[PDB]
Amino acid sequence: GAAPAGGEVRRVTMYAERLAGGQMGYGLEKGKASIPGPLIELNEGDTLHVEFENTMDVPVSLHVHGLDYEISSDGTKQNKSHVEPGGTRTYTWRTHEPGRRADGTWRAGSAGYWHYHDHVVGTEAGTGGIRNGLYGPVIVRRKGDVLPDATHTIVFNDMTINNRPAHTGPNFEATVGDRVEIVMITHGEYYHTFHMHGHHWADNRTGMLTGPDDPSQVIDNKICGPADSFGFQIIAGEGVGAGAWMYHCHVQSHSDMGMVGLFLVKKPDGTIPGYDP
Amino acid sequence: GAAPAGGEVRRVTMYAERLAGGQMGYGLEKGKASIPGPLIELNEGDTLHVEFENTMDVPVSLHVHGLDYEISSDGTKQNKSHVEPGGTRTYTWRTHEPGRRADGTWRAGSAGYWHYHDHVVGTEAGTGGIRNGLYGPVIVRRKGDVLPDATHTIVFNDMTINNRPAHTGPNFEATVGDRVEIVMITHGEYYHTFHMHGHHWADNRTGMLTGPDDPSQVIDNKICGPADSFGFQIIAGEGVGAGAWMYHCHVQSHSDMGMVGLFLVKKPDGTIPGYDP
Amino acid sequence: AGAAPAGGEVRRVTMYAERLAGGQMGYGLEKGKASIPGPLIELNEGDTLHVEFENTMDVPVSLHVHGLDYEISSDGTKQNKSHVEPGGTRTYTWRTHEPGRRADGTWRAGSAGYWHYHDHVVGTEAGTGGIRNGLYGPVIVRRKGDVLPDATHTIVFNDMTINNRPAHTGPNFEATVGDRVEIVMITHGEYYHTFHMHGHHWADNRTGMLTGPDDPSQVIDNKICGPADSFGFQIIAGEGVGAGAWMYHCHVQSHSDMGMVGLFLVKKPDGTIPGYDP
Ligand SMILES: [Cu+2]
Ligand SMILES: [Cu+2]
Ligand SMILES: [Cu+2]
Ligand SMILES: [Cu+2]
Ligand SMILES: [Cu+2]
Ligand SMILES: [Cu+2]
Ligand SMILES: [Cu+2]
Ligand SMILES: [Cu+2]
Ligand SMILES: [Cu+2]
Ligand SMILES: [Cu+2]
Ligand SMILES: [Cu+2]
Ligand SMILES: [Cu+2]
């Protein structure tokens, strides 16, 4: 199962809302904001019009990485493209396919693992908004990219995973053989290293080698810093079997302070050998 | 147009000089030192003889990354390849084309985005010299590489850009459609993440995909540490239009403290929409 | 030195965890010969390795590997009850596989790469104390046809140390001009680092050398790394640069200043190293 060629013009509503404990999040439905924000998926060539509403009492913005946007959708104070309290704005994201330019150079397409976040809450860099939870994933697919059975987003935000209390995962479940996609985003002040037990991926656009000629390093550990994003697909349990497979930041004190979760890979009967919570 | 094949013997004079406020810099002519130092450009195969003079009252050196040099041009005190106050020395850098070794393996060429810096001021690692401004860019081009309309060098040195006071850019100007080359160098104590608004590049040698078979990740954000260097070319405003396009370190406190500048992309008439200083 | 053959052998080795002087701990293949870093394990894709492991210490220890195939019983974690109690024995099994085309039409990557093993239970359930103490080592998995080196050297940036050594004590490595030298670079602990070698450069890809004229990988001499990262490469000693005492170091300025530096001593065939004067 593979992504089709893109070129659809899509529309969605998005809201920025306050959540419990001083947090803030994005959502597609009023009153249902989440941290991380909703996953937005596009095929190269698609256009997305985000009909955005700020329900909070502070100005907020939406800034996206990687995609094509004009200055009016930059989402910064510099370009007066933030949204006043209670205000509305349509942010527009475009994407393009790769292709040969007339001068013979190759223009890269938009495809990749990307993300969106606030750029105006607290500081002109969005330090408050990002700390509070205003971030989410974007995936742009190229025609023919393999589609996963499930997608999970892991954000290292300062010393938290997904703004959760320490030592609370999140955990993600799969069955042996599932094609599982991970989107990995980092935000805030610190560098991290992301590691998965029992699984590995290629350090390239899709996380999978294109074939026998792709020299990309195969890895299970990767250094990342604020606003980095990457992603990959794995076959759950491939060559290793079912089990509670931990993922964690590998900076030692970060793991000791709770930047750890479980990739729970189940047998067909739904059980997980050796896992006794 | 495009870079030709190299193989010329080139020469330049270089001086290390004190600048205002305890700073130090390299320059090609006496009294003309700059931070960053002068851009050196070579084609693979070229040899460069750097006729160097230390005009300061403390020893200094010149050490280069990536290029070929004999141990006598290492630029360290350990083999006495530094330059005493008032002294002169010729440092020689060579470069080579790619090609197959007699052992059957492929030898990479010298081409890339590189840099030179001091190795003896303050400590035998050059900590004081680098802090003071003794660093600059070197580009080595491969035959057939596309040539840019302009080149700009951005150095994250500790918590400054190009040793400038916080919140002073620098800014760079272009017109929509210009082919703009960025050289990005990091120095000092801290990791950083370089981000550009409105533009992106391939994480490979040139910043441009070689064609449809290149699997390199396309990015707009990249983690870097002391002495890392990379570069890329972008088409100014491609798919996004004119405007003041922010670049910054994405480590949140670094952006907030002033590691931010503007890529000012003008319409053909010279105006920048939505921008007034 | 030739090229790696196709794998598929079942191999066995004894490994011991032992205390070393000064609160340290290391792995070894023979009792009383533990080292930091631990012994280099080399496998060809398809090989299986049974590590007959014995913990000779008075505290629990484990063995956890990156990159290779292992079942949950060889995870080497307390949460999977695959640690080794004091005085205990356990067989840890690592498997490896070749690349190939899957049933779903996609390409499955092989196990080949520069990997590493380390403790996961000493001090904390992340192995923080064991890693600090020295319980880490390299493991290389080769693909059929990979070029073999004349020598392999392992450089571990563990916190503010290289290979747990006292500051300003190297290590140094020797080669002759033209030798094919393999470096395995591992990082552990709390800090990011940047590894730099004077006079030498490599491709930022699986093997450290470009596969040919179509490989677009960046060529570098400086690389940022963080805890549990591993990479490796092969260089031709002195290629285009000649003999000399070629420094390698972390390029984070305070780290170099505190002594995270060593020497790659490249000699001419007659043994000379121009200008070397320690
Ligand atoms: Cu920004
Ligand atoms: Cu972390
Ligand atoms: Cu692991
Ligand atoms: Cu951003
Ligand atoms: Cu150095
Ligand atoms: Cu920074
Ligand atoms: Cu941005
Ligand atoms: Cu350097
Ligand atoms: Cu672990
Ligand atoms: Cu370091
Ligand atoms: Cu150097
Ligand atoms: Cu690990």
Residue numbers in the entry:
A (entry chain B), B (entry chain C): 41 to 317
C (entry chain A): 40 to 317
From the study:
Substrate oxidation occurs near the Cu1 ion (named T1 center), and electrons are then transferred via the Cys-His pathway to the Cu2 and Cu3α-Cu3β (TNC), where the reduction of oxygen to water takes place.
The structure of this variant was solved with high resolution (1.3 Å), and analysis showed a continuous chain of water molecules from the enzyme surface to the Cu2 ion, whereas in the SgfSLwt the water chain was interrupted by the side group of Arg 240. Moreover, the water molecule closest to His 240 forms hydrogen bonds with this residue and with Asp 108, which is impossible in the SgfSLwt structure due to the side-chain of Arg 240. Substitution of Arg 240 to His leads to the interaction of polar amino acids (Asp 108 and some others) in the T2 tunnel with water molecules directly, and not through an intermediary (Arg 240). Increased amounts of water molecules allowed us to more accurately analyze the effect of amino acids in the T2 and T3 tunnels on the SgfSL functioning. The double mutant His165Ala/Arg240H retained an increased residual reaction rate at slightly acidic and neutral conditions. The catalytic efficiencies of double-mutant variants His165Ala/Met199Gly and His165Ala/Arg240His toward ABTS and 2.6-DMP are nearly identical to that observed with single-mutant form His165Ala. In the present study, the His165Ala/Met199Gly mutant retained practically the same high resistance to azide ions as His165Ala, and the resistance of His165Ala/Arg240His variant was 3-fold higher than that of the wild type laccase. Based on the high-resolution structure and biochemical data, we propose that the transfer of protons to the TNC clarifies the role of the water molecules chain located in the T2 tunnel of laccase structures, and the removal of water as a reaction product can occur through the T3 tunnel but not the T2.
